[PDB]
Design an enzyme around this catalytic site. Sequence first.
Site, short mmCIF file in Angstrom:
data_model
loop_
_atom_site.label_atom_id
_atom_site.label_comp_id
_atom_site.label_asym_id
_atom_site.label_seq_id
_atom_site.Cartn_x
_atom_site.Cartn_y
_atom_site.Cartn_z
NE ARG D 49 -3.21 2.37 3.32
CZ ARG D 49 -2.82 2.94 3.87
NH1 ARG D 49 -1.83 3.41 5.32
NH2 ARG D 49 -3.65 4.42 4.35
NE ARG D 90 -6.24 21.65 5.36
CZ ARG D 90 -5.49 21.55 4.57
NH1 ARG D 90 -3.94 21.93 5.08
NH2 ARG D 90 -5.25 22.50 3.50
CE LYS D 238 -8.95 4.72 3.42
NZ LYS D 238 -7.82 5.67 2.93
K LIG Z 1 -4.72 7.46 2.10
MG LIG Z 2 -8.86 7.14 6.07
#
Ligand SMILES: [K+]
Ligand SMILES: [Mg+2]
Lengths: 498, 498, 498, 498
Positions: D49, D90, D238
């Site tokens: 990764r 942010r 994800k």
């Molecule tokens: K990442």
């Molecule tokens: Mg994450």
Amino acid sequence: SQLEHNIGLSIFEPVAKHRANRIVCTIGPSTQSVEALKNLMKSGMSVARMNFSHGSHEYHQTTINNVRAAAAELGLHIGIALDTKGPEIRTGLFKDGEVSFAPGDIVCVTTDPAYEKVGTKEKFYIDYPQLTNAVRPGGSIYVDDGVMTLRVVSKEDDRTLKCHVNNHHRLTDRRGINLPGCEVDLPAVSEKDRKDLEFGVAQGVDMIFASFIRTAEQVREVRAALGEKGKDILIISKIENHQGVQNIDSIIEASNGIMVARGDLGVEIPAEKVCVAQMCIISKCNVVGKPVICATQMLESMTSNPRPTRAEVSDVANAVLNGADCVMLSGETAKGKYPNEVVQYMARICVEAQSATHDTVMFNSIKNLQKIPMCPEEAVCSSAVASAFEVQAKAMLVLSNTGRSARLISKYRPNCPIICVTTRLQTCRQLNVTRSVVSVFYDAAKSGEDKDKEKRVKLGLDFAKKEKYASTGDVVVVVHADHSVKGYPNQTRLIYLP
Amino acid sequence: SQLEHNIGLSIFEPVAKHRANRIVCTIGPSTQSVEALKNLMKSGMSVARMNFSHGSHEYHQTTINNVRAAAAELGLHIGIALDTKGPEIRTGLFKDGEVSFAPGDIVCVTTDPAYEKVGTKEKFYIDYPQLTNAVRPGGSIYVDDGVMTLRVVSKEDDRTLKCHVNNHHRLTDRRGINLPGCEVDLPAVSEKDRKDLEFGVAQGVDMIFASFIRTAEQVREVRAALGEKGKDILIISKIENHQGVQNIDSIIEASNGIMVARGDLGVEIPAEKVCVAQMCIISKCNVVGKPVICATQMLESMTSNPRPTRAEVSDVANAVLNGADCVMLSGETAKGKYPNEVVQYMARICVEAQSATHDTVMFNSIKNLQKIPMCPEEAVCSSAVASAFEVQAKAMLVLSNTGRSARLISKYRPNCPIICVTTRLQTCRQLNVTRSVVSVFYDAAKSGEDKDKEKRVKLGLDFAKKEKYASTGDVVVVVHADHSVKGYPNQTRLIYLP
Amino acid sequence: SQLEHNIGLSIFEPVAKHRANRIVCTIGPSTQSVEALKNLMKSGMSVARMNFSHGSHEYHQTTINNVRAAAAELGLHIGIALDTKGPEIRTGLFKDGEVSFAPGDIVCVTTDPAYEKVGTKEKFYIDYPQLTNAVRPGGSIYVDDGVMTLRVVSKEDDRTLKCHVNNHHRLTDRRGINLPGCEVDLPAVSEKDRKDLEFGVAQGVDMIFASFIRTAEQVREVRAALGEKGKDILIISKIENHQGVQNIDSIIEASNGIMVARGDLGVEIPAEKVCVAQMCIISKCNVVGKPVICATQMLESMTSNPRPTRAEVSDVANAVLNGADCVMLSGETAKGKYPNEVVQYMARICVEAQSATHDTVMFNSIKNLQKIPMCPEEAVCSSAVASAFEVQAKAMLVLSNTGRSARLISKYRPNCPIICVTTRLQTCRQLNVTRSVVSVFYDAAKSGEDKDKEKRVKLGLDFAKKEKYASTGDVVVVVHADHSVKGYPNQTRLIYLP
Amino acid sequence: SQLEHNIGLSIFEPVAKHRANRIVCTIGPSTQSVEALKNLMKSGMSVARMNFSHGSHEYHQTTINNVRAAAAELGLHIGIALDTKGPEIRTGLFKDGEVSFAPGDIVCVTTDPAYEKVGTKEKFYIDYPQLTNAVRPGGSIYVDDGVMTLRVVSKEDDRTLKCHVNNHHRLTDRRGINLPGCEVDLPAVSEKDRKDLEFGVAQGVDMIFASFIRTAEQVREVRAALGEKGKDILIISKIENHQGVQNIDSIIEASNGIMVARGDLGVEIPAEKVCVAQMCIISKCNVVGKPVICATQMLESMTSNPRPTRAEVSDVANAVLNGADCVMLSGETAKGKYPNEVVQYMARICVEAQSATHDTVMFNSIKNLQKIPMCPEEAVCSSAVASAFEVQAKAMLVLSNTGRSARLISKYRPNCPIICVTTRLQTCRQLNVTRSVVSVFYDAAKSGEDKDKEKRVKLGLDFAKKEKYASTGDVVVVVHADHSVKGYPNQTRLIYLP
Ligand SMILES: [K+]
Ligand SMILES: [Mg+2]
Ligand SMILES: O=P(O)(O)OC[C@H]1O[C@@](CO)(OP(=O)(O)O)[C@@H](O)[C@@H]1O
Ligand SMILES: O=P(O)(O)OC[C@H]1O[C@@](CO)(OP(=O)(O)O)[C@@H](O)[C@@H]1O
Ligand SMILES: [K+]
Ligand SMILES: [K+]
Ligand SMILES: [K+]
Ligand SMILES: [Mg+2]
Ligand SMILES: [Mg+2]
Ligand SMILES: [Mg+2]
């Protein structure tokens, strides 16, 4: 659960189009002609039973010839079964053809053959010469499907018992005798049985229905009597006494299949216990994948009536739900007034019960009882049935030469037909006692070796189309060997009909 | 699995000592005398059925009086059921009082009452005015309890169908008609049925077996005819045609119980579909916990013969395995030659089937289909049965005044007797249609109100000991209310017999 | 199935309002003050663990006194556990408080106590006098949670081994030593342990966490050391070596409960095997209904951080899903910076896992493994839990004096609180290691014998209301004896809150 | 039952020889060198990764080149994954570059970009314009990866919220913001992410781990950015916030696979709910048969320490027992001190968990949730796995060019290796995220087209022998197409190794 399945049942849904269970018909005066036999076949008969309790060899030769002619005309493969006399005991004849007894009548029963033809209310003959060894004072003799009982009062001498009649009965010529709870020592294969079985072999019968099988060793005596030339003939052991039930596991292991022969069984043991024996024997056969036949009085009243009773319909349906491959007719077809109609009823009842059966309960219960690891062919056949469920296949197709692979697929109880392409006519005929199987004959001498399986698979897929099992675009599960392996199937394919 | 259960069955083991299932016997010339009834009761009759299709009120009064005298002599509580004649469609009369038809005969059937008394081969009357709406071309009309069948060819006018005769038959005056699969609209209660129900209420019958129930509204009409004075009499709805089957959920809801009336049913729907209806209806009754009776031709051949056929034995055993509370006898006891022996066989078969039943499978399957949350009394009853299995209790004991709590325990199918101590004699009689229950009467006018339950519990536990259900040191599961809750049982206890 | 349950899980649904699992906290410098202990209790602590590996009796007396004062202020019953030193092995001290090793460093380890205080990189002390008998040349000595290993090069003499250091490590004073695969022969109860246990008895501790239990006989040695006055103190055996795992069945049978002591266990056996041991030990405890505690490094990083890692959250949730009654904290609360927060996290994780647990899988799996027939109290308790599921009870209520009946209900894993009304304060405290139980003290000396159970049942139903377990009209399942039976509960009632 | 399975586990038995689960390692300064990568591969890394949250394209190019050189040296096929930076919210900057807050401080947060560079204790900027629509009074804003939390008190105007600071914290410039439970609308692909995906496509990466996937439409946007040339690259979505969890079904549908990205997830949703999300997401991926990776802090403490904590071991084992194909390492391998040892532990834990898994439970649970009828290839693959269990096959062998058939077999969770012979090197690399699969490359340009499968089957069977998955005389289950079917496998065979 079964309860949850039951509450979802509907009388308004279409039933299965293809009947999985098989019907065995006994041939007699009603049904022996070529015409009668054709109509029986059209009605649903898969196996013709010859009852060698009665009739000469010439009579049974006529049955054999007529069955073959009828089957050839219709292009069917019909099994022919020889059901042995075995260790039967019967009365002699009576002065007049009939005698009537009331309770308390004292009667002498004799083994002395001088009395064979001249039975009276005072004295008559029974054809078991060791009678007075087998039944003691205080014991009971069951006469005529156990309808009349005699208490043995005393032994008059070695040939003669003095007996007390327990109930009203009209006794006619040559009725059956049962002696439950007695040591009766008769061979499984008498000299008469031996000649019958040699006749069966000579005439190429497909299977023996062996009467009064008590032990595995008796199954082996039948197999020895069949000889070198009879080694591929199925032995279906008939379970019809206490000792047969007791020894069921070893009898099943020795036999090709079993008949629950409820007529004698329900006189030899208390009639109410037959239901328990039946359930147990059928389930034991299912677990090892051997064919099992439920027999006797299933549609009895249709011997004289054009419709069955409610109990008779129930009996046939429940034999099918119990897991029986076949159901049988005796007097209903041998001597009945409505042989075609009774077979047509039996076929409709089979189909309804089949249609009310939960798809996969049998498959899962049967698989869960097998020892792991399986043989590869049994892993192939069980997983092929699973794949037929998963894709809702309309048919399965298996190449089988001995029958073994078709029976192994049938063991797992698919809900669709199992088309078996076979290279032996006798396999075609013997597979008539196995649920779901429909056979197609591939003549390898005429058509070639077919090492790559393509001719036989095409023959079976064409049959599937022709018989309206499936049509173009339907999925079929096809089981046979790959191009190398010999002796068993190691391969499953899913194929869309072209 | 059922398969695994079956392969472990033995015919050799002792059977249950206490029969759970219940036997309904029809009374007739074979059985009406006080002495005959006593023998029937000793043989195992729990409920006496009067078939009001035949016989005067005077005839049935004799049955009522004799049943009560016989029961009082033996100290038994025996239910008395009144089975109604119900609605019927019949032909008219025929010239000369008879006409013979052959296959292919074309006959007009008319609802024009001009033709009522002059039916011929050409044209005859059927007394149902909606006939030409009910049955369509291609449909069937059955005549004479299904024996002759007509196919409807065409509608000629709004009162006349042209029909094709299917089989040889001779009609006499006013034969029964069935319209298989057709919506028939006839009152639930005829004028005859009203007088009969009035008689039943006046004479104090325990239940009505209501013929040809097609809808829930019909049940309500029967209930309304019974009126205020018959409000505690059970209505057992007889399912006899496709409407009853189709509407079964709402019928079960309106009824106290169900009879699967297989005689009429197997004329109205195909005979082979009766097995499917039976399984579905019995399971549906089990799931809601209302009593269900399987009826008709269960042991038919014992009308004439001293032993049943093999199909008959299996029919009885399978009705019990299906889940039926009761099995029923009709002509076997009403007019047969062997009324005591047929009841004794039926009892022995019930016991074998009961002994072959997997202990806990019904319990679990029934419990798993109940809606959660249960009412408290049903949680109590179902967990009481669970505790009986866990401790192998030899009996359960429940206080029930209406019968409701006893039926609720029976719903969960314990394997032991359910002793019910009740304060109503009619409740003792009514609980005779409910599997496992054995009733004891507590006379509160004589012994006191028993608010703390102790007298009733003592009576029940003394009864268990005396009747040999259990002895000192055995566990009994005891269900009733605690000292303050009224209206239902909220308490279960495990008690050792002192 | 678990898979089917999982795919239906939602992070958006409300979680359980009442936490079933219990938290054991180790007391130390962070948490010994009365104030600290009150905040730990408010945060979720049910049992205070005293680690007698360290500290004098005076130190632990302070813990005991402060726990009792804090618990009295808050009106709670909090268990107090004494966790034995047992057969620990440690290094001595080092010149400087620290020494550092690199791989290949040769170091002598000595049993000679002259070196106890003056350990160096060349030579240091281990407090196991039979060291040179237990570990041979070629063997390994694990130091400091098995972080550093030494290979034994040679035995210099009876007091001294020459060793090869395998890895970089900074060794500090008095680190643990493990000798897996060695015959280490130390008593389960040293003279030090004996004095500790006599102190525990004198001070009335509720339970012992007995370290390094290897055999059932060692459990009996602990019980003998507790003496006549300590017979009701729970012995929770800690499983922390190979032999303990091997002898788990006999250890479970001898003990009141088990701790999976993963710290030592994961040095004594390969760390990756601890997961398998844990699952097996917890499930074995569940099956026999004895409390089981999962211990060690569950939220380790929260010793210094205000939030746990993802692995630590998972670890706590999975201990709960595995079936652990309790989960434990050690350094997290004894010496951590966030003792209140770590207990609050552990409590939230417990509740989420409890809320993701299938209602009835544990109940059914546990019941299916019990021997039939059950004892009556276990049939009562298991069927009471079943009735709580069926009615969706918001609470159960059990009278228990010893604790036994509360533990028997907890064994069957209801999804609601189990309110236990008890006549002993010590039972209140000991039931803190049992899932779901909330205790209420009934002072029978003050309030009367309560033979008819009414005072105690009222006390528990009032508690149920006050604590917001249930309100008026909710159903509660109430378990105790009827008015006669003594020694166990034989009765279950369903009661609507008044 | 799982309970019964657990109580029969032994720590003493030998573990599986062939690890089924797969390990994803993040590459960083600890691991980037060719020599470090070779060791990682030997230790058990299957997929490398690259975390594009950090490092230039030049840095990641080095990783790509080094991974390929290391893999070529060892003759391995190693997947290369590109893990995107993804969207972020942010703060702005602060005066003096830092500000400290205390509990109870009241701070205005604004989306007015006037304030971007001048944040104070009083007021600071957050760069998400929809902020005042996304979060409501009473909601939370998390700052600095969850470390500081604000409660929103009120909305002041359409760009400004007044907030209450919950805890002590010091903010520096541009800290991360999370809006827990809030619908956030940000592009799936940033301009940075585009350049990064362009680089991944040009350099031939095997899969993208796409950050913060909230909807199926976002997956499609990633897929569209990869464009025609990246159409064969897997998208592993994800799941990092509540939207991902809520929309999981449609996301799984659009994706090639899923990562449970527990770091971000456990900031966005309560940390204790991550366990519930994890179980649900893994099971959902299992049911459809797409690969799923469990990520983040699995063995965190091994960043610094040579052994893992007890919670860490259990986290890895439980991710495998949950059903995850892969487990992942981040800082443990990217920047830790013990990158080889952490991978070796992770492998040993996977193997223990695998060995503790009930053989056939996953198979049956997964199969039971599939819609019937299956497609033929899925019936074939699922029945192939069944046959492997029935014969205890030591391996399966599948021909797959795209990977699809291999994933379909892995979906049914056999207990043996799945050897996949493929004609694409990228398929070898991609199959590294799929449980059990071991790939062998068939070079069709070099060896021929292999229409009859024989060369590929030979390669696969030779590979099984060489790699010691199976030897002569073992059964292998072999799945591919028959001689005419194209596009999918329609055939399974059981073959004995020669
Ligand atoms: K990442
Ligand atoms: Mg994450
Ligand atoms: O005759 P049985 O024992 O069923 O075996 C039949 C099997 O053997 C094989 C392989 O030997 O027959 P065949 O050679 O005729 O092709 C399989 O194709 C077939 O399925
Ligand atoms: O203390 P344990 O062993 O749980 O037994 C408690 C049980 O015993 C009984 C009966 O003896 O206690 P009690 O006498 O206190 O009422 C039950 O009511 C109670 O449920
Ligand atoms: K015969
Ligand atoms: K009637
Ligand atoms: K200790
Ligand atoms: Mg016979
Ligand atoms: Mg009727
Ligand atoms: Mg320890």
